[PDB]
Design an enzyme around this catalytic site. Structure first.
Site, PDB file in Angstrom:
ATOM      1  N   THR A   1      42.725  42.888  39.665  1.00  0.00           N
ATOM      2  CA  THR A   1      43.663  43.740  40.470  1.00  0.00           C
ATOM      3  C   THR A   1      43.834  45.263  40.400  1.00  0.00           C
ATOM      4  O   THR A   1      43.765  45.835  39.338  1.00  0.00           O
ATOM      5  CB  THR A   1      45.079  43.281  40.091  1.00  0.00           C
ATOM      6  OG1 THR A   1      45.071  41.917  40.299  1.00  0.00           O
ATOM      7  CG2 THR A   1      46.236  43.843  40.891  1.00  0.00           C
TER       8      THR A   1
HETATM    9  C1  LIG Z   1      43.107  41.595  38.988  1.00  0.00           C
HETATM   10  C2  LIG Z   1      42.155  40.497  39.379  1.00  0.00           C
HETATM   11  C3  LIG Z   1      42.893  41.830  37.480  1.00  0.00           C
HETATM   12  O1  LIG Z   1      44.104  42.255  36.801  1.00  0.00           O
HETATM   13  C4  LIG Z   1      44.580  41.135  39.305  1.00  0.00           C
HETATM   14  O2  LIG Z   1      45.420  41.378  38.215  1.00  0.00           O
HETATM   15  C5  LIG Z   1      44.849  39.694  39.825  1.00  0.00           C
HETATM   16  C6  LIG Z   1      46.362  39.570  39.967  1.00  0.00           C
HETATM   17  C7  LIG Z   1      46.886  38.770  41.122  1.00  0.00           C
HETATM   18  C8  LIG Z   1      46.297  37.405  41.093  1.00  0.00           C
HETATM   19  C9  LIG Z   1      48.352  38.618  40.875  1.00  0.00           C
HETATM   20  N1  LIG Z   1      44.536  38.627  38.887  1.00  0.00           N
HETATM   21  C10 LIG Z   1      43.919  37.491  39.177  1.00  0.00           C
HETATM   22  O3  LIG Z   1      43.471  37.194  40.257  1.00  0.00           O
HETATM   23  C11 LIG Z   1      43.771  36.552  38.020  1.00  0.00           C
HETATM   24  C12 LIG Z   1      42.918  37.237  36.986  1.00  0.00           C
HETATM   25  C13 LIG Z   1      43.139  36.684  35.771  1.00  0.00           C
HETATM   26  C14 LIG Z   1      42.286  35.731  35.292  1.00  0.00           C
HETATM   27  C15 LIG Z   1      42.527  35.168  34.063  1.00  0.00           C
HETATM   28  C16 LIG Z   1      43.613  35.579  33.320  1.00  0.00           C
HETATM   29  C17 LIG Z   1      44.460  36.540  33.793  1.00  0.00           C
HETATM   30  C18 LIG Z   1      44.209  37.088  35.022  1.00  0.00           C
HETATM   31  N2  LIG Z   1      43.127  35.329  38.454  1.00  0.00           N
HETATM   32  C19 LIG Z   1      43.751  34.172  38.356  1.00  0.00           C
HETATM   33  O4  LIG Z   1      44.872  34.050  37.932  1.00  0.00           O
HETATM   34  C20 LIG Z   1      43.030  32.953  38.798  1.00  0.00           C
HETATM   35  C21 LIG Z   1      43.807  32.452  39.973  1.00  0.00           C
HETATM   36  C22 LIG Z   1      43.224  31.169  40.489  1.00  0.00           C
HETATM   37  C23 LIG Z   1      41.909  31.468  41.126  1.00  0.00           C
HETATM   38  C24 LIG Z   1      44.096  30.696  41.602  1.00  0.00           C
HETATM   39  N3  LIG Z   1      43.179  31.968  37.740  1.00  0.00           N
HETATM   40  C25 LIG Z   1      42.280  31.715  36.798  1.00  0.00           C
HETATM   41  O5  LIG Z   1      41.204  32.251  36.680  1.00  0.00           O
HETATM   42  C26 LIG Z   1      42.650  30.676  35.817  1.00  0.00           C
HETATM   43  C27 LIG Z   1      43.121  31.384  34.591  1.00  0.00           C
HETATM   44  C28 LIG Z   1      43.801  30.425  33.643  1.00  0.00           C
HETATM   45  C29 LIG Z   1      44.421  31.234  32.740  1.00  0.00           C
HETATM   46  C30 LIG Z   1      43.719  31.711  31.658  1.00  0.00           C
HETATM   47  C31 LIG Z   1      44.342  32.557  30.755  1.00  0.00           C
HETATM   48  C32 LIG Z   1      45.659  32.927  30.945  1.00  0.00           C
HETATM   49  C33 LIG Z   1      46.355  32.441  32.030  1.00  0.00           C
HETATM   50  C34 LIG Z   1      45.735  31.601  32.933  1.00  0.00           C
HETATM   51  N4  LIG Z   1      41.413  30.034  35.472  1.00  0.00           N
HETATM   52  C35 LIG Z   1      41.049  28.927  36.092  1.00  0.00           C
HETATM   53  O6  LIG Z   1      41.708  28.389  36.973  1.00  0.00           O
HETATM   54  C36 LIG Z   1      39.733  28.337  35.658  1.00  0.00           C
HETATM   55  N5  LIG Z   1      39.523  27.134  36.450  1.00  0.00           N
HETATM   56  C37 LIG Z   1      38.339  26.455  35.922  1.00  0.00           C
HETATM   57  C38 LIG Z   1      38.049  25.216  36.744  1.00  0.00           C
HETATM   58  O7  LIG Z   1      37.859  25.588  38.125  1.00  0.00           O
HETATM   59  C39 LIG Z   1      38.987  26.296  38.695  1.00  0.00           C
HETATM   60  C40 LIG Z   1      39.318  27.509  37.858  1.00  0.00           C
END
Ligand SMILES: *[C@@](C)(CO)[C@](*)(O)[C@H](CC(C)C)NC(=O)[C@H](Cc1ccccc1)NC(=O)[C@H](CC(C)C)NC(=O)[C@H](CCc1ccccc1)NC(=O)CN1CCOCC1
Ligand SMILES: *[C@@](C)(CO)[C@](*)(O)[C@H](CC(C)C)NC(=O)[C@H](Cc1ccccc1)NC(=O)[C@H](CC(C)C)NC(=O)[C@H](CCc1ccccc1)NC(=O)CN1CCOCC1
Ligand SMILES: *[C@@](C)(CO)[C@](*)(O)[C@H](CC(C)C)NC(=O)[C@H](Cc1ccccc1)NC(=O)[C@H](CC(C)C)NC(=O)[C@H](CCc1ccccc1)NC(=O)CN1CCOCC1
Ligand SMILES: [Cl-]
Ligand SMILES: [Mg+2]
Ligand SMILES: [Mg+2]
Lengths: 233, 212, 222, 222, 195, 196, 125, 204, 195
Positions: free
Chosen positions: F1
């Site tokens: 983000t």
């Molecule tokens: C940018 C990208 C970086 O800061 C932004 O901040 C955005 C913010 C928006 C979403 C509010 N962040 C994200 O998109 C975020 C990035 C991220 C990833 C991991 C940790 C923290 C931040 N992405 C996500 O949250 C995605 C959203 C999904 C696609 C809907 N989630 C994941 O990647 C989750 C993470 C799980 C997790 C790990 C550590 C801490 C908290 C949560 N991962 C998965 O779902 C993995 N999964 C494996 C199987 O197949 C599906 C995905």
């Protein structure tokens, strides 16, 4: 044992009735940083072959130098270097495939996925894949990285098997490739809008297109999307 | 696997199972675990299939070269030591072999040598080798006497493999029998456990744990 | 850390008849949950009426086949164009495989052809060179599905003669090329149904004294 | 799995494949991934099979009690809120990836929920192993102002992309259409493009082939 | 703790249990009785983790004795074995499970039949004609498969048991200092003093 | 983000990209990271999508209950509730939030709340993975008491660069304008901002 | 390394270096071997132009290769030590691998093989 | 130390024309050591049959648990539980232990007494229901069973023919698995009679 | 390989070495001679890693025998022990060291004195009146500290040695299947057949 530093993303390609098309974007990523934007990842060899490379760019540049040197070596003591004894796509591929597997066998791979697209001397379409592991395979459509997951499904709707190749024109084939590049721009986080495309036809020869852009994108619907469930403002 | 060979009044008995496994997957029920090095030498195989199969056929080539060079059949001691010295060079590399070199010569008489992949080489009268060696030992030791007849010794060897084939999950298929005399080795057939078990159960009255 | 191995999926199957032998294999090539090719052959004519397939990690599979094919070529040069017998080929392959004992070819190899009496022969190899002649062998991803079916239908295992009180076994007999191909096709359609790495197409190579014939059949593409 | 959701003129449609895997083995060739939360709120589920079934039933049960308590037809946002708070509480250990859709007094809605408890809004969505294959199709052919018949076609085409190209997905296409002012229609096995071909041979055994040791009548009665 | 055997014959159950108690490189005791009488016609031998073994045996013993007083009645070997299995089945999913393997030899007075149950620390119960825990089974089972008959006498069972102990004394790596043998029959539990 | 909030003469403007990623796959290219916790108190969400949503939902619940008893809460009060959740649960959260609101007394205010759960009141704030690439640009170009049009250009140009360099940022540039006039939503598409 | 082919053929088909090595043997003190029915006896000449010798410590003409085999020689004394050493090492090596001492034929065959190797190896006489 | 493959064993179920069949092996071992050749894995509660593979202590525990539950069901409902209902009970009970599961692979089989319809079902260790028209497989030789069933099976088999098919499926699958075999039992289930047959198989 | 002892008395050196060869849960042999004669008046016992032990012993043996032939002379026990120590001292810093512990019992004919050397796999040499390798020492050293006298006869030494073996058979966990006893004196090396 390596780890890739500066990387290139998807390379996509397909066969059509008279030849092959191959495309790849002009980005050189440095992790999440979109570092370099003028990187050419399609490299022609002669007037009948184009090698598309993804993965580590330093290793890509090494492969460029090998292919360049291969053309030079072939010309030595060869009066028919620009005729019967010119470099074929199949020769260029097999050479790369040999190197890739030798390097993986020494536990020091060239961290790449490679697609050699071209047309043979007898007019036959050539399209084959090779990667860091030395794994090789051929198909009417071939793609690397995210291209394998998103482009191939789209390209296979056009050419689903061998018998669909004569039925596919260069107009239809190019349209599918350009569409696939747009989809990758929507969905691949390490992709760029700018890309190169190459057509190798058995009649019209090698057509290399630079500085293309993804266009006719759908973003308008974004304005209607509010919140993440219950928000109405 | 389960392999045994014991020495007795009438020479040597050698008995092996025929199973080959890759984990819990039964890969084959018809593996030849006895190598026929020459008319007077046998070698048993337990452990890594390729390691045993490759190096024991190699051993046979070395034994042939000996009798070409020395105009005389190689001793059981020398034959075993070629194999033991070989695997010792590969010690630590991860070879997996539990072998028994069985044979007869004039100077030695009937002789058995246990040779394994960590370099152990032992002369002896009785040995059982493999995952089901303990099951074979239980039946063999409790019924063994030096004064067994050729007929009884052959059966005890067969019955001991059967015992292991039954209890050990990684042994089975069929029993291969050999008898080594002063005149050389004699093959005494392949015996499928599928028929042998029930034949032994009925005739012997044993295996009362199983639903008849 | 760099992992030099990969799994390209697929499955292979070899059956021996009286005066023939078949070596079948699906044409699907995969990595993880992606299809690389729907038609990538992995059963090859190597000359001297020997067909070969090395299923598993395709790079090692191709390397092995390539080396064996080359071994056949040099066998002709060094021994006055003598025909390489299937038993001699098998032993030669053991040494190829065991030559890399400490950095193995990750493949299940099967070869098929005719022995020196003209009878059908199938040999199978583990990754490091242990080999065995058999009437029947499946190898690869769906080997655990296909193999017990072959035990039952080719070698008539667990089948007894009706009304004999489970005392007389069903007698062993050679199968016709027609009956064998039926079993191959049914084996692969079954394997395709229940294994995700198996499908797309089936390619069979049949070996008789007359030569090497090919047959191709469609399989489900999901 | 491959699951999708597509909005249209007067409602929303969701679809799913019918493959259930156990490693590389296809466990169920025709499992139902479309779940009824309430009469007009339906849910497509990917991920851990037991979790998607259990979480959808629990929230469905609580939604019914809530509907009876409030004397109102349930809302999609209520199911969305209850699901995400439950999943979030379990920090992703309940591996349910859901596409929640439905019609209610507020209108028609389409959402997705991930195992960790994050929700997304959209006109077209896809989840599961074959979501990339499906999303490629959706990104290529989707447009604003789809009709009912166009949305069903687009949804099923997106599932098909998964069926053919993703090894994790296969078999049939289930669909559920939720239109405003009408009853939701659940179209079980809407497409069946993976029918098993006729077997080459019948494997019906001669009676008495199997060797038997004992017989006995079992008592099921009191 | 190491070797515990059990043999059910025509009219009795015979349990044999090793006498050695070893910690480190020292045999601390060579006369240890690895068994407890649960009731007049039910005997339990045990082997496993130090401390756990006795603590578990005595806990079971106390419970069975409590039952006997409450109901003025002896529980059947089947009932006792089921109670023991359940305790171990609870234990395996506890914070710290009992690492104890047991054999329960008993004589059912209502059926007039001897019964031998083998139960491992997971709570895996099986009724057997002959049983063993630990590495002993790897030798004794095959030996018994061959020599055992269902209609044997107590004396024949003791000779069969001697054949097991001899084989173990020959092929086992560790010195287990012989065994204490006990017989369970219609007349209760008694120890063989000369073995 | 890539997210940011900027105070100006008439109030405050929040800005954000629309990209949500799973590794290198874009799970959502039209995400709305600007979320309402109260009528004229909004926040920018960066970090875990699940955590930031769960947090914002709770904050909205708290400020709704606050309003029922004590009337409209201050922007500082909102930031304090965010802080309390982020600080006390710092071990189990991955949330970088920027809180922005408009009072009539206090005008525009921006509070940033990084991973630790610390609070920082600033004239403007930037956050998210893409913010690293625009610290230089934003510091050089920011001025206090800018006009609405100047602030919109400042945010647009800034997020355009963040998006250009950061692979984890992209899609559309959403903006939310908070003034005495009310609440205004703005959107800007690639074709416009990319060629700035 | 010194590579020169010293032992080579001449026009008449002779290897002069090997034949000149025989002349050195012909110069050496006489040695005789006679084998009986149950024994072998090795006799050796010692030239008497050397008085004031110390016969305790002077190298003996007959050398034990193993406890059961002996070796005498005629020719260059310094050269004999090299052959004797090699033979003694091979004797112990044979016991180690074959678990049996060498036969007299085997030990002879080895020593003869060493002598031959020096007739067609480069840089040696 | 993989709970599902310490003891070993297999169960298979099939449907036929107005009948169902459920079969299991008899082995119970401790890894390589075969311990018991009398360990049956199929139980029944009224006319509903339940086969259970996996860790043997859980096989026993669950049998005792479902007997417990079906007995109380019958006392309150005043009727025997049906296969469809029992399937749901099994799923509920397994998912109750979601984060500390019983390491089992249960298989329900039976005929609904009201409708007369043949019914079979399978579950994973946390209670996911796998319903099937044709066949369900479970155990250490599940791959083998999947391969045998998929090729040998055909619809609408008569009870006598169905017996041969299911038996041959189990036997040949068990012979390719080291931890399965040592005897086998087959239940043939018709609307109001049930036949139980012990199979002769190789004992290695 | 496990138990090797050594006792130097007035006029001889007595070596005692266990007969058991165990791999896994099976005693493969109970009549193993864990020693090699290096020269007529020098004997070496050995214990340690499988394969290494014999390979090392025979390698030393071949070298000492080669020396004896070359010089027509027997090396002193001191000289042999120094040669052995150096080989192990080289070995410990090799790619794969010999994991072998040895005792060298010899009779020096020039000094007319018995000599016992204890050398571990690191190349740590000590001359001792009595020695042991492995866990044996933890019992035998204290026992010998008490009962040993320097002027004992060979017969007194054998009784002293019986006292060690009895203690080991009582308190050691593993069954080592008794010992092979050999005596080294002015008349060479001989084996005690009844022990
Ligand atoms: C940018 C990208 C970086 O800061 C932004 O901040 C955005 C913010 C928006 C979403 C509010 N962040 C994200 O998109 C975020 C990035 C991220 C990833 C991991 C940790 C923290 C931040 N992405 C996500 O949250 C995605 C959203 C999904 C696609 C809907 N989630 C994941 O990647 C989750 C993470 C799980 C997790 C790990 C550590 C801490 C908290 C949560 N991962 C998965 O779902 C993995 N999964 C494996 C199987 O197949 C599906 C995905
Ligand atoms: C009893 C039965 C068990 O020990 C006997 O000892 C037999 C001895 C006979 C065969 C000589 N032993 C085995 O069968 C032996 C067990 C074993 C396996 C592996 C290591 C040590 C011992 N089995 C094998 O060696 C099998 C034989 C094949 C099945 C015919 N081979 C494999 O497991 C191979 C080779 C493994 C290997 C060893 C060393 C280096 C590299 C590889 N492994 C595979 O094929 C891999 N695997 C097979 C299933 O599909 C996925 C890949
Ligand atoms: C596509 C098809 C995924 O490729 C879809 O996402 C579907 C979703 C539909 C079916 C709801 N997903 C699956 O089919 C799913 C894939 C999967 C597997 C494992 C973990 C996560 C996802 N498969 C399953 O959930 C199966 C359903 C069975 C076949 C009925 N379940 C299993 O494979 C279970 C997994 C249970 C589990 C426990 C704890 C955490 C996560 C999952 N595995 C086993 O039963 C394996 N094993 C058998 C021997 O006994 C021990 C357990
Ligand atoms: Cl979000
Ligand atoms: Mg077995
Ligand atoms: Mg970007």
């Amino acid at each position: 044992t390596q780890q890739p530093i500066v990387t290139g993303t998807s390379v996509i390609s397909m066969k059509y009735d008279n030849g092959v098309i191959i495309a790849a974007d002009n980005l050189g990523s440095y992790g999440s940083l979109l570092r370099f934007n003028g990187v050419e990842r399609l490299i022609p060899v002669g007037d009948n072959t184009v090698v598309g490379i993804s993965g580590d760019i330093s290793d890509m540049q090494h492969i460029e130098r090998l292919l360049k040197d291969l053309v030079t070596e072939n010309a030595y003591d060869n009066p028919l270097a620009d005729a019967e004894e010119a470099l074929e796509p199949s020769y260029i591929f097999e050479y790369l495939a040999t190197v890739m597997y030798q390097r993986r066998s020494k536990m020091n791979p060239l961290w790449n996925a490679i697609i050699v697209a071209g047309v043979q001397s007898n007019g036959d379409q050539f399209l084959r894949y090779v990667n860091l592991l030395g794994v090789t395979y051929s198909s009417p459509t071939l793609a690397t990285g995210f291209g394998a997951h998103m482009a191939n499904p789209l390209l296979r709707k056009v050419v689903d098997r061998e018998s669909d190749i004569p039925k596919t024109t260069v107009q239809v084939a190019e349209e599918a490739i350009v569409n696939a590049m747009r989809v990758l721009y929507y969905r691949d986080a390490r992709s760029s809008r700018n890309f190169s495309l190459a057509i190798i036809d058995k009649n019209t020869g090698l057509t290399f297109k630079k500085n293309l852009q993804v266009e006719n994108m759908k973003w308008d619907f974004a304005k209607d999307i509010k919140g993440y469930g219950t928000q109405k403002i | 696997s389960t392999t045994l060979a014991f020495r007795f009044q009438g020479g040597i008995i050698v008995a092996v199972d025929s199973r080959a496994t890759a984990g819990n997957w039964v890969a084959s029920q018809t593996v030849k675990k006895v190598i026929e090095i020459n008319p007077f030498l046998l070698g048993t195989m337990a452990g890594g299939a390729a390691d045993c199969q490759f190096w024991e056929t190699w051993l046979g080539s070395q034994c042939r070269l000996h009798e070409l060079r020395e105009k005389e059949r190689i001793s059981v001691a020398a034959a075993s030591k070629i194999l033991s010295n070989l695997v010792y060079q590969y010690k630590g590399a991860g070879l997996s072999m539990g072998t028994m070199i069985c044979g007869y010569t004039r100077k030695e008489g009937p002789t058995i040598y246990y040779v394994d992949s960590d370099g152990t080489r032992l002369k002896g009268d009785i040995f059982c080798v493999g995952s089901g060696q303990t099951f074979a030992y239980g039946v063999l030791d409790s019924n063994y006497k030096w004064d067994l007849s050729v007929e009884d010794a052959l059966y005890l060897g067969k019955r001991s493999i059967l015992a292991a084939a039954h209890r050990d999950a990684y042994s089975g298929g069929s029993v291969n029998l050999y008898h080594v005399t002063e005149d050389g080795w004699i093959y005494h057939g392949n015996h499928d456990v599928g028929e042998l078990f029930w034949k032994v159960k009925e005739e012997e009255g044993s295996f009362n744990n199983v639903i008849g | 850390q760099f992992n030099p191995y990969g799994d390209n999926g697929g499955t292979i199957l070899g059956i021996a008849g009286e005066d023939f032998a078949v070596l079948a294999g699906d044409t699907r090539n995969i990595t993880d949950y992606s299809i690389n090719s729907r038609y990538e052959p992995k059963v090859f004519d190597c000359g001297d009426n020997i067909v070969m397939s090395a299923n598993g990690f395709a790079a090692d599979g191709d390397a092995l086949v390539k080396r064996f094919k080359n071994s056949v070529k040099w066998y002709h040069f060094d021994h006055n164009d003598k025909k390489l017998s299937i038993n001699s080929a098998a032993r030669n392959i053991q040494h190829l495989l065991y030559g890399k004992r400490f950095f193995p070819y990750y493949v299940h190899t099967i070869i098929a052809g005719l022995d020196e009496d003209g009878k059908g022969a199938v040999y199978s190899f583990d990754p490091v060179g242990s080999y065995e002649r058999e009437q029947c062998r499946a190898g690869g991803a769906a080997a655990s599905l296909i193999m017990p079916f072959l035990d039952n239908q080719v070698n008539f295992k667990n089948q007894y003669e009706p009304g004999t009180n489970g005392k007389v076994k069903k007698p062993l007999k050679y199968l016709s090329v027609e009956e064998v191909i039926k079993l191959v096709r049914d084996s692969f359609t079954s394997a395709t149904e229940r294994h995700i790495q198996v499908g797309d197409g089936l390619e069979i190579l049949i070996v008789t004294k007359d030569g090497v014939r090919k047959e191709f059949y469609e399989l489900k593409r999901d | 799995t491959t699951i999708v959701g597509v909005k249209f003129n007067n409602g929303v449609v969701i679809a799913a494949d019918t493959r259930s895997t156990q490693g590389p083995i296809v466990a169920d060739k025709n499992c139902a991934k479309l779940h009824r939360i309430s009469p007009k709120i339906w849910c497509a589920g990917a991920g851990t099979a037991a979790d998607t079934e259990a979480v959808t039933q629990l929230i469905g049960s609580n939604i019914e009690l809530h509907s009876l308590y409030t004397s109102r037809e349930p809302r999609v946002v209520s199911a969305l809120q209850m699901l995400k708070q439950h999943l979030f509480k379990y920090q992703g250990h309940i591996g349910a990836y859901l596409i929640v859709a439905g019609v209610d007094p507020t209108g028609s809605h389409l959402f997705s929920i991930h195992a960790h408890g994050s929700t997304d809004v959209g006109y077209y969505l896809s989840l599961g192993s074959g979501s990339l294959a499906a999303m490629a199709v959706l990104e290529s052919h989707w447009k604003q102002d789809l009709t009912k018949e166009e949305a069903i076609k687009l949804a099923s085409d997106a599932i098909q992309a998964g069926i053919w190209n993703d090894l994790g997905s296969g078999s049939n296409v289930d669909v559920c259409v939720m239109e405003i002012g009408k009853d939701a229609e659940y179209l079980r096995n809407y497409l069946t493009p993976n029918v098993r071909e006729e077997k080459q041979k019948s494997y019906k055994f001669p009676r008495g082939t199997t060797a038997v040791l004992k017989e006995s009548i079992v008592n099921i009665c009191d | 703790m190491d070797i515990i055997l059990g043999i059910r014959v025509q009219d009795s159950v015979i349990l044999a249990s090793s006498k050695a108690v070893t910690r480190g490189i020292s045999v601390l005791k060579d006369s240890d009785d690895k068994t407890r009488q649960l009731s007049p016609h039910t005997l339990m031998s045990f082997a496993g983790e130090a401390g756990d073994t006795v603590q578990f045996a005595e806990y079971i013993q106390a419970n069975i004795q409590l039952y006997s007083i409450r109901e003025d009645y002896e529980l059947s070997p089947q009932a006792v074995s089921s109670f023991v299995r359940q305790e171990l089945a609870k234990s395996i999913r506890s914070r710290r499970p009992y690492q104890v393997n047991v054999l329960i030899g008993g004589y059912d007075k209502k059926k007039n039949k001897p019964e031998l149950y083998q139960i491992d620390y997971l709570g895996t119960k099986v009724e057997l004609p002959y049983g063993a825990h630990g590495y002993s089974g790897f030798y004794t089972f095959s030996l018994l498969d061959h020599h055992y008959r269902p209609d044997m006498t107590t004396e024949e069972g003791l000779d069969l048991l001697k054949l097991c102990v001899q084989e173990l004394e020959k092929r086992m790596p560790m010195d287990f200092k012989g065994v204490i043998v006990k017989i369970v029959d219609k007349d209760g539990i008694r120890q063989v003093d000369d073995f | 983000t890539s997210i940011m909030a900027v105070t100006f003469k008439d109030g405050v403007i929040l800005g954000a990209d629309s990209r949500t990623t799973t590794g290198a796959y874009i799970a959502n290219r039209v995400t709305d990271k600007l979320t309402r916790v109260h009528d004229k108190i909004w926040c920018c969400r960066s970090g875990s999508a699940a955590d930031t949503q769960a947090i914002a939902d709770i904050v909205q619940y708290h400020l709704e209950l606050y309003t029922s008893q004590y009337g409209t809460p201050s922007t500082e009060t909102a930031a304090s509730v965010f802080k309390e959740l982020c600080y006390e649960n710092k071990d189990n959260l991955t949330a970088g939030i920027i809180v922005a609101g408009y009072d009539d007394k206090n005008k525009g205010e921006v509070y940033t709340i990084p991973l630790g759960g610390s609070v920082h009141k600033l004239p403007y704030a930037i956050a998210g993975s893409g913010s690293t690439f625009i610290y230089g640009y934003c510091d050089k170009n920011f001025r206090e008491n800018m006009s609405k049009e100047e602030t919109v250009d400042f945010i647009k140009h800034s997020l355009s660069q963040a998006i250009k360099w950061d692979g984890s940022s992209g899609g559309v540039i959403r903006m939310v304008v908070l003034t005495a006039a009310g609440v205004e939503r703005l959107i800007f598409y690639p074709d416009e901002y990319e060629q700035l | 390394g010194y590579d020169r082919a010293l032992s080579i053929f001449s026009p008449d088909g002779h290897i002069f270096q090997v034949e000149y090595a025989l002349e050195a043997v012909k110069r050496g003190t006489c040695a005789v071997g006679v084998k009986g029915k149950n024994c072998v006896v090795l006799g050796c000449e010692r030239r008497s132009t050397l008085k004031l010798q110390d016969t305790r410590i002077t190298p003996s003409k007959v050398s034990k290769i193993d406890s059961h085999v002996v070796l005498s020689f005629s020719g260059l004394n310094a050269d004999s030590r090299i052959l004797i050493e090699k033979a003694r090492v091979e004797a112990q090596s044979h016991r180690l691998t074959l678990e049996d001492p060498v036969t007299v034929e085997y030990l002879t065959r080895y020593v003869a093989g060493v002598q031959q190797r020096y007739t067609q190896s480069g840089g040696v006489r | 130390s993989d709970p599902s493959s310490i003891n070993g064993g297999i169960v298979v179920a099939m449907t036929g024309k107005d009948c169902v069949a459920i079969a299991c092996d008899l082995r119970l071992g401790s890894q390589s050591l075969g311990v018991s050749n009398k360990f049956e894995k199929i139980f029944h509660y009224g006319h509903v049959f339940l086969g259970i593979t996996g860790l043997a202590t859980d096989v026993t525990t669950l049998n005792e648990m479902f007997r417990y539950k079906t007995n109380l069901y019958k006392l309150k409902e005043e009727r025997a539980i049906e296969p469809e209902t029992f399937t749901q009970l099994v799923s509920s009970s397994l998912y109750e232990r979601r984060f500390g599961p019983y390491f089992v692979g249960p298989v329900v089989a039976g005929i609904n007494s009201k409708s007369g319809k043949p019914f079979i079902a399978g579950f994973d260790l946390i209670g996911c229901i796998d319903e099937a028209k044709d066949f369900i497989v479970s155990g250490t030789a599940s791959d083998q069973l999947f391969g045998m069933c998929e090729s040998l099976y055909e619809p609408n088999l008569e009870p006598e023919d169905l017996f041969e098919t299911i038996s041959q499926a189990l036997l040949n699958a068990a012979d390719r698995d080291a931890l399965s075999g040592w005897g086998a039992v087959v239940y043939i289930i018709k609307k109001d009679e049930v036949v139980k047959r012990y199979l002769k198989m190789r004992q290695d």
